[PDB]
């Protein structure tokens, strides 16, 4: 079984910052590609960014700058780095690590942003 | 002459369609999908043999 | 096997000569969501077969 500890969302003012980070606990393999995925308040997933096992990454949005991955290869955490918080990013995130065989998917934490 | 005719039909037989669409290999195969490209290319086969 | 398709070119092939067999069956009680399921993702872009 996988599990994937989400922590870090909550209420933050405009142009505040907060750590959003997961570890994948489990049974994983070896390429382990992972990401983040947006779901706004009763609209579709998008993906956020993406981090690889190489340290390549691939964000899927024009938000370079805003957030940025950092990699644990030791314990093989991912954190992301919220800064220059606007309302339009209020949704609900969810780290997905693709993998080798079997997708999966996070619970799920609530950023909120507004003034 | 005997030589020769036979040589000539020998040749001329290529452009038969022997039941299939068409008597060129290579519009048949670009044209189709490769279940029925073999079924096509097995009668081309089976009359030039 | 032998079908030209976006899924079959991108995502998932099947030889010519593949024996065995497939098996499909709906999943609306379990793999669709009213707000709509999305878990499940294809691919459409790809640069070769």
């Known amino acids: 079984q996988v599990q994937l500890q989400e922590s870090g969302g909550g209420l933050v003012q405009a142009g505040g910052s907060l750590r959003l980070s997961c570890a994948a606990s489990?049974?994983?393999?070896?390429?382990?590609?992972m990401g983040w995925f947006r779901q706004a308040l009763g609209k579709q997933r998008e993906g956020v960014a993406f981090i690889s096992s190489i340290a390549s990454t691939s964000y899927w949005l024009p938000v370079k700058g805003r957030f940025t991955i950092t990699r644990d290869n030791t314990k093989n955490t991912v954190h992301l780095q919220m800064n220059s918080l606007i309302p339009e990013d209020t949704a609900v995130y969810y780290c997905?690590?693709?993998?080798?065989?079997?997708?999966?998917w996070g619970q799920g934490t609530q950023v909120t942003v507004s003034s | 002459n005997h030589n020769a005719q036979a040589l000539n039909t020998l040749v001329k037989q290529l452009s038969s369609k022997f039941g299939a669409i068409s008597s060129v290999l290579n519009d048949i195969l670009s044209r189709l999908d490769p279940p029925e490209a073999e079924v096509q290319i097995d009668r081309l086969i089976t009359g030039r043999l | 096997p032998g079908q030209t398709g976006n899924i079959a070119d991108y995502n998932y092939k099947l030889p010519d000569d593949f024996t065995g067999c497939v098996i499909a069956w709906n999943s609306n009680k379990l793999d669709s969501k009213p707000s709509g399921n999305y878990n499940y993702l294809y691919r459409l872009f790809r640069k070769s077969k």
């Open positions: 489990g049974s994983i393999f070896s390429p382990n590609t």
């Open positions: 997905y690590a693709v993998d080798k065989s079997q997708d999966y």
